[PDB]
């Protein structure tokens, strides 16, 4: 299973700070405000909400989801980043993994590079790098996480089509 139950407690304003989107009759996390309870208990972009307080979220609208949240007295079952997959690479003697990107999206793979040896696709978005989330970051700052990383660089990626659909 990649499924877990997460318990959270609304906040000062009773907000919890989340936004959800409807994809393919499922409910997915589109936004997670940082330093939020939702932020705290670990929800991330592209995570799927199976139920909310035990109620199936299947077929709900994005508004119907939100309305059920704005009406509690909060438990969620979630399935974790079902659309991301993981790729591991190793820096060069020049400390390079060999791909090029813009707005977080992989744009080119360099010949004879770790990225080439591992099947990195173009038109995919970077979601995490070595355990750290990176959606919503600028390219400057994705670059140093890359640039300061150790030899091994594990990232997780999402195909551009489903990334465009959740935003």
């Amino acid at each position: 299973q990649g499924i877990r139950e997460v318990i959270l407690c609304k906040d000062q304003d009773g907000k919890i700070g989340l936004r959800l989107k409807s994809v393919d009759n499922g409910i997915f996390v589109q936004l997670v405000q940082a330093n939020s309870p939702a932020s705290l208990v670990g929800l991330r972009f592209g995570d799927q909400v199976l139920q909310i307080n035990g109620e199936n979220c299947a077929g709900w609208s994005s508004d119907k989801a939100h309305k059920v949240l704005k009406q509690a007295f909060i438990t969620m079952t979630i399935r974790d980043r079902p659309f991301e997959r993981t790729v591991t690479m190793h820096k060069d003697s020049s400390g390079h993994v060999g791909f090029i990107f813009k707005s977080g999206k992989i744009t080119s793979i360099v010949k004879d590079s770790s990225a080439a040896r591992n099947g990195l696709l173009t038109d995919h978005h970077i979601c995490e790098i070595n355990g750290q989330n990176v959606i919503g970051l600028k390219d400057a700052q994705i670059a140093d996480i890359l640039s300061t990383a150790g030899t091994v660089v594990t990232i997780t990626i999402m195909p551009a089509f489903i990334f465009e659909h959740i935003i």
Binding site: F99, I100, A143
Partner: peptide
């Protein structure tokens, strides 16, 4: 105009 692309 520049590409504003990044490499790793």
């Amino acid at each position: 105009a520049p590409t504003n692309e990044f490499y790793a």
